Amino acid sequence: NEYFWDEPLPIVDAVVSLTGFALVGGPARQDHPRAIESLKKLNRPYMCALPLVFQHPIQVALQIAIPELDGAIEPIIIALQDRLEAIAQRAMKWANLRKKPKLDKKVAITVFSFPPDKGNVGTAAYLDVFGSIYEVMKGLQGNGYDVQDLPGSAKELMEAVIHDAQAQYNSPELNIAHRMSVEQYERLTPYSVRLEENWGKPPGHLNSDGQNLLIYGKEFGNVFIGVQPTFGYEGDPMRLLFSRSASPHHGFAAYYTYLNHIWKADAVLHFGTHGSLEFLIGTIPNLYYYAANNPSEATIAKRRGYASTISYLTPPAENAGLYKGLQELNELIGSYQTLKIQIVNTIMDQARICNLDQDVNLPDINAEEMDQGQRDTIVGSVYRKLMEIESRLLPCGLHVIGQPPSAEEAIATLVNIASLDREDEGIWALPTLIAESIGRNMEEIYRNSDKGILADVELLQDITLATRAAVAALVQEQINAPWVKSLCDSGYPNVNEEKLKPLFEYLEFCLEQVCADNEFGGLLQALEGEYVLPGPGGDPIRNPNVLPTGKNIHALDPQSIPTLAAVQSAKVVVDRLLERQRAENGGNYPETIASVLWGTDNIKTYGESLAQIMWMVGAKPVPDALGRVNKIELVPLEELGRPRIDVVVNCSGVFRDLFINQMNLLDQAVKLAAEADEPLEMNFVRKHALEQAEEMGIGVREAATRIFSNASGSYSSNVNLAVENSSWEDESELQEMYLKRKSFAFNSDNPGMMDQNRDMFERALKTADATFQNLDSSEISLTDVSHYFDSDPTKLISTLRDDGKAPAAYIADTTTANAQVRTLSETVRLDARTKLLNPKWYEGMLSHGYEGVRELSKRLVNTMGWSATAGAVDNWVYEDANSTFIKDEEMCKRLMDLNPNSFRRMVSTLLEVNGRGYWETSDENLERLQELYQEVEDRIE
Amino acid sequence: HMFTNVKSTIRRVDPEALNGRQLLKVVYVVLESQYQSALSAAVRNINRTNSSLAIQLTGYLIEELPENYANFKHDVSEANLFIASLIFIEDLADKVVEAVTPYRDNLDAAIVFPSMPQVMRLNKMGSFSMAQLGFQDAMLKLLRTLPTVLKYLPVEKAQDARNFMLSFQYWLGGSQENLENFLLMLTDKYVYPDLGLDVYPDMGIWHPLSMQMFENVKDYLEWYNQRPDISEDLKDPLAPCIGLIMQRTHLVTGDDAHYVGMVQELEAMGARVICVFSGGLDFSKPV
């Protein structure tokens, strides 16, 4: 504030901090609001470079996360030259964004994976790519940028970049923006030779032509829309399991050479659609439009692509609703009521027609020989499953950047915001208040609703409807510029009105942030060489501070989790998991549970899934005076009330990158448990560790190695790549690759040395009785991305176990106040019923056209992944998918015309699940699919 | 009972990889299992984070001393630091002094916390022993007596006695970081002085009998009046109150023996004391 100023004006174009600290520290606890306030006034690009660079993976992980909270850009990832030059050149280029006139600025925008063929599908971006690019182009043009020949629409935009994309008359072909020669190539890219190990001498099959390298895209004045069809690539990850290493082909390198040394872009804009499978961009300022609900992958981009990650809202979430057979059943259950035998028999019949017999226990007994309760609980349990399907809050569509939701299409998002207690802000959820007004506990209703008690299942729905109508009253009254009258009109007149006040005062504030249009504003500020406001990810419902969007989003201080609320919520989930495991399998406790840790959900819940694993082993985090969680301790068996349970923990590469300090804590806890002087029947960790130590000839502590991940620099088991390329022969191949890639053991007694320990990995996995993951959210669910099944060891454990027994598979959901520990199959069915097979969902997607079909195949490809890793997909899922999308001749034609490439993917996927034995169906269906594959093959090729 | 108290089967903690670091060897014999686990946690943490120092820790509970006793004598012989606390068993105690006394000169330091007087006589920190001195309540008794001793000693010997008081306060704290500072303080001052082993506000209020600094008068006086070791005369608002000004650096270094003696002398005379410090050179701010 003193030396960077002179009404005074800034005398600096860009700031590079070399301290490695927060802008505003102290003794202790960084002050980010006062740093943000200062950096906003100065309004310059703020870059930070840790002094560690100019010379303990835990120390690095803790340090690097702090400047990110200040909104810092990272100009860096034996001599000083490369580091000094890297920081200097990027600081200059960032500074040049101010010194350069607006009409001379050249903004490049690269698109990934168009047309959407094979390779990795990427992340759950929920992005209308070309629809968003078009809005960006017009926004730039209408602000003073030289955008020449701006097309008439988004459809016209894609047509300009992808000639005949819909394959009507000629085959789809990408617009060639430039043809650089081998001479020009090798001259401008010094690292060309290092790529010749896998691709040989340029050009080489990829991006040819045959003499020149092809730079796909199209120029529109000072704005260039480019296309990177393939990274170089996914394409059979089995080719890289040995001597061969990964390297992008010449075409991929040639693209960024064009932007750096020929078109000379001043700024590049990417979209967070392919996440961690994206890592040559150079010294040019690198912008990303990342989803607000994906902080974890946004920070990887910050640390691997020197990126500034501007956020966009995911589409306005809607209740999934009920449809077809599910609707008829809802109506059947609806009465009852006034009809109160024969109906219960038909309710059970339609429930079996909807295949709900595998979600709720439906005996072969007739209703005539049941009690009053036996009939009440049957219809009550079927009903609660229907309401779970109907009330699932998920996006049904794609988002266009700069196009915020209306007040109307934000009520559903708002009702769930109102359905969560918040001690500070100091308000209670609407349902709890409504429940309190009639002398009830909202969680007692939840617990009873889970048991299938009709009186409580109906009461839940009534309170839900009362909540789902009251919030809409506040929204409607906001539109024309009342919610208490709605509560009375719903039947709850004794609601604490004192507490109703700050609640709706909060909800109205949230409404403005949901509908705020700051997304394009963030891009401008970045391009103008200004300072973009930093904000937190990721889940708006659980944390409305993620709103509004258009900010440079970040993750959190890895020493701030788990919170006390997180560890308490974790015990509940664990107790629920164990209860469900004892029943239907015991009732003995499992001796070992295999879990996966994702960074994403731990950011959103402040360490819940992390805290679950601590509790399984009987350990607790110990915050210091400053509130930093950097210690851990065992809890006495008296407090645990059950045996310590052994764990096998699969940490994602991303989790390892962001939270290696937590991996350190976990490994400490597990080893403490194994050393505990406790009876073996009370300590399954020690029970196993002792046995393993003898058989391996090592010490107990070393035998207690349970915390694993990818090797440093690596991400995923590559199972997702193999599934997306259909490049594997049998399940043993996938599992072999899993054991090779995921068996790198973390050591809290030697943190820097993460060595492979496949022997320990297998011995630990052999003892697993259960498999466990936490659901991130409804938007990022089991079929929305491929990472879940990628880390899934379910079938692997079957082949490892001597008894060949398949472990029980569970998925925890804490995205609402009603925490559920579902089985894997139950969750897969929930995804199928609410997304792929749901008219409300697929029609919403298809209403965006070309990119809508891509979303369909994505959900279907990931479903196939679950068949390969766990076999958790019921046959009716594929059969119904084939019904609505392929047997329907009208829908089949609509799909093939909208998007030949994505339709081709749906066909082959259905063809594949049958070919491998996951889908049994009539030959008439297989013959039709086999033909449709040829019809679309010809259109494209 | 193991059901209500978490106990460990591990007596020995070794560094995974020595590397280019110096090795500190510590032997403890203790009664409380909590300090066993806290010491171990402190040692394992230092081994995994410190880039110039590694610690080997071997320990036994007093009853375990018969196979173990043979290793005990050998561990003591190679030890830099010897620690003992709450040792109250006649033949057991005698076995301890027999094993320590030969190497009492070899040990860089020998720290015995409230035990049988026979064991207490093993205490040796630099020039300070159980000479020169003129369950939880027993530790407070000895702790509060230490400042009263400082004045009768020369400066260099006073600081040794203060370091003893300091390591005693860390021990009573019992936290993992308390014991880490305990070991690192003992190492830097008596074992590896040339290793350069090296939260404090810019200015504040300090009292030797308080482990935390105070950043305002209110918090300090609140703490002052709750002290059970002082006469009610000191808490009287009409009591003589003397302010002391000192450099923060001597507090963060631990070389504050004469400051501690100054505070004790004033209090002994019936004066309430307010010691301010600053890291800067404008001492008008704390004033």
UniProtKB/TrEMBL annotation, chain B:
Residue stretches in coiled coil: none
Q: Where is the Magnesium chelatase subunit H N-terminal domain?
A: 25-165
**Record family assignment:** Belongs to the Mg-chelatase subunit H family.
Protein name (database record): magnesium chelatase
Per the UniProt record, the source organism is Synechocystis sp. (strain ATCC 27184 / PCC 6803 / Kazusa)
